[PDB]
Design a binder for these strands. Sequence first.
RNA 1: GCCGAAGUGCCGCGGUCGGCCGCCUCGAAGCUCCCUUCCCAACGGGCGGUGGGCUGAAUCCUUUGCAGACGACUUAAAUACGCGACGGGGCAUUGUAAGUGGCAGAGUGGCCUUGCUGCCACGAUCCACUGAGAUCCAGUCCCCGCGUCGCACGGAUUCGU
RNA 2: CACCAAGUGUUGGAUUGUUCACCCACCAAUAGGGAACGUGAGCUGGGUUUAGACCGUCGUGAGACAGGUUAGUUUUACCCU
RNA 3: UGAACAGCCUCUGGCCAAUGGAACAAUGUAGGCAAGGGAAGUCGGCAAAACGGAUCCGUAACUUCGGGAAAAGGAUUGGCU
RNA 4: GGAGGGCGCGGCGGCCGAUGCAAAACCCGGGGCGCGAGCCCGGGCGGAGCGGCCGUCGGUGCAGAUCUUGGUGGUAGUAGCAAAUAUUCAAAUGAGAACUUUGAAGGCCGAAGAGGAGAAAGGUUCCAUGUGAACGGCACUUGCACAUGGGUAAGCCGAUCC
Lengths: 120, 340
Amino acid sequence: MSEKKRGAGTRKDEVVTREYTINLHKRLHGCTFKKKAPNAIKEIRKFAQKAMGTTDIRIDVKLNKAIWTNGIRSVPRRVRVRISRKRNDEEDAKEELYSLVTVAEIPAEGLKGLGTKVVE
Amino acid sequence: KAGMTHIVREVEKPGSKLHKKETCEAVTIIETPPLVIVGLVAYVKTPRGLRTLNSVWAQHLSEDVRRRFYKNWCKSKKKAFTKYALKYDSDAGKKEIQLQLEKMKKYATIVRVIAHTQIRKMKGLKQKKAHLMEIQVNGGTIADKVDYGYKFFEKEVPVEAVFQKDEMVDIIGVTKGKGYEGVVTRWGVTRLPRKTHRGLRKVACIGAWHPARVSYTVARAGQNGYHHRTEMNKKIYKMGKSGQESHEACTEFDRTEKDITPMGGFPHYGVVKGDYLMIKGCCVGPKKRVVTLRQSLLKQTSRLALEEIKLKFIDTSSKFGHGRFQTTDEKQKFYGRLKA
RNA sequence: GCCGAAGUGCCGCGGUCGGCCGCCUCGAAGCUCCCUUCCCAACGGGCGGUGGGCUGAAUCCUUUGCAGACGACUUAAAUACGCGACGGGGCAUUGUAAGUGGCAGAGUGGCCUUGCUGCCACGAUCCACUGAGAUCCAGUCCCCGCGUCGCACGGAUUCGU
RNA sequence: CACCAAGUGUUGGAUUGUUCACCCACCAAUAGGGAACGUGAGCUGGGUUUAGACCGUCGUGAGACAGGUUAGUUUUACCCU
RNA sequence: UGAACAGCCUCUGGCCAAUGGAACAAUGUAGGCAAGGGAAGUCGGCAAAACGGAUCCGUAACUUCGGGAAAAGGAUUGGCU
RNA sequence: GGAGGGCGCGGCGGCCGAUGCAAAACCCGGGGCGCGAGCCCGGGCGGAGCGGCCGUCGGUGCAGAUCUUGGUGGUAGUAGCAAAUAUUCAAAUGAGAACUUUGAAGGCCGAAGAGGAGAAAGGUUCCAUGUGAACGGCACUUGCACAUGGGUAAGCCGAUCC
């Protein structure tokens, strides 16, 4: 899914992946407890939409489990999410990661190598 | 309006029981950058009130008008456009300026200045957009003042050159927008009192039967905040700037050096690291809104302060268990280090 | 050059040029054909001929929070002192985590090699490591760390005296 | 005591449905009047003023009472100004 | 858990259909909390609110001696060993 | 309020006319007449019977009646569609899927249940298959809808018997 560039800025590539930490803690506090978890998942779709510039995101059921396990009224503050951007169809795919607790850093460079492996 | 801080000043009076000694005071801190005066405008008084005859624009505008332009004009600096007139033919434009001098000096024009606020000298305030405005010029004879005014647009004007310390200055701004608010917080009416009641925050009756028309004077809901307001007679305690106007403080008893921003910065404004102006008490507006200071119309003074009242404490508060810059911050950081 | 106003018009010069029964002529005073105002000024506009010149703005989606019921206000982004999520550091909050060690610990079991360091567990809880851990911009602050968007926008649209 | 003057104030409680009333107490002052007896799609519903009911009086009785006493549904604005 | 066929949580059985999305303004409706004061509010404590379970202690003028009585009023209440 | 003189409609006796080569009806910011009631004529639409005049006769002329019956506005695309703790993600299918169906997930009733059944009641609603014209005040390929089929078997259970 076309991260295309021509004449303008870094990155002459299409599909890659990057791991970014997704902010649930904003806007969500303004939202009701009753609608808190379905609002929370919608935030994730919005961030992907802006970043890629593409409307179509499908979000994995594994990601849905992570948000909703705490409940409708309790949502985690942030979750690290992997955002991949693949297909001829042009869909964005998001999934869970793992970390105990630590830091956000330079995952992206290693993930370029990961994206190459999907190909060949 | 940057926010508000506090200052402690050691009074002096005799009428009431307690007087003299330290007193807490609220003070508004305002960032007041030096402002780029663009033009000398000739307004002649008419029996319909003042009428401009022409407006003069500086000889070299190319960044000033280009930051100004997302209101003032529109579009947020995209494709190199939004157009202002380019500087005239060399001796044609100079002749035009001096043609104005003749007109001014025959009817004795009330000299005025168009200036603009260069907010681009500030960084913490997220707006980059200069506000064009009219500030009147006051002084002597018409010939001298106009002549000076031409030379005066070719250079900034600082805080120290417009207000003297101690002065009573009327401060005028537009209040914080609250939104739409009830009768109770718009006119200051009572709640209607009952155990339960089909209207609580309400007025009961809005007129009488025979005048078939609701008065303008009766209290009902509507917008509140974002209103022009004048709040008078504010003592200008201190004018200064970070590094190269003011020092900071004089050490030991006077006070120890404390930057006028609170540590962690002003909530929802930004961090002050520039000009500052201490104006008495509360000031209209939220934070990140234009506030204008304009000299008191009642030049009388009389006795409120009169005498100056040496700055002791600033309360630029870094507290709730610590604080007062540098050393105390280091003490807290000592209980950190490798995860703080 | 003046009148600043609501000057936007007035006054002066000099040729050029039209008009001038101002003055003198020609055929001529007949060209709306023997009552039917029969349109005739010019403030303005329309429309051609030809001599120049002006080389764009605005609006949508998006964004800010300065702002908001929704428009709107007020910021930002199309190639730049440009801009964005995290992290790091500051700032805050609360109060000292997980894990590990301990004649810390009311005590109690159970095996003997029967213990002036007896060992193995159990044990609310306490302490050390640990003013720690967790959270911290959303309407906190900063960065020149890290990667991208940043399509040198084309995607969507409107306007002429 | 009289004048110009509504510019600006003119009160809290106790009790009574009572405004009125009458006290307490402050005070510079605790003026008086009107606006469908201002003010119920703003309220409350305590009074007046329904249907239940008690008592007294009057009435052969049913009932009545400018006599007392209690409990008793407060609808609709989104239209136009 | 606890007296509980109370409430709350869950098993087993049964739904996931209560038009959905966005902002989440005033104003409502429904639910909470408020320093200091404490019914001064109001026709009236209307309901909010507090008390509340139990064990122990303590218990009134009065009374048809059966009661009032859980009078009032206090103290106590864990984890674990 | 009376009397007077007329006009229009329906039908009947008389009398005369008109017609599929276009009657009646209906439409017409088209003409003209009469003070009016009304009339006349043209054009357009239409397709089978009709009108004038003289007598006769009425269930004979409308603006209403908190009118009757039918139609249609503004209201208004406005109030609203807000109780019942709650949805979400991926796949399947299909033209089209927040709602169907399957999984995953989150929940909810919380065993005096939103449960498994019988009474009473309804009467085929049960289930398959077909399937979106109406209807499920959203949607919809789904339905307790519509269409098409099938299904209830008793010496011991009930009625019966008393």
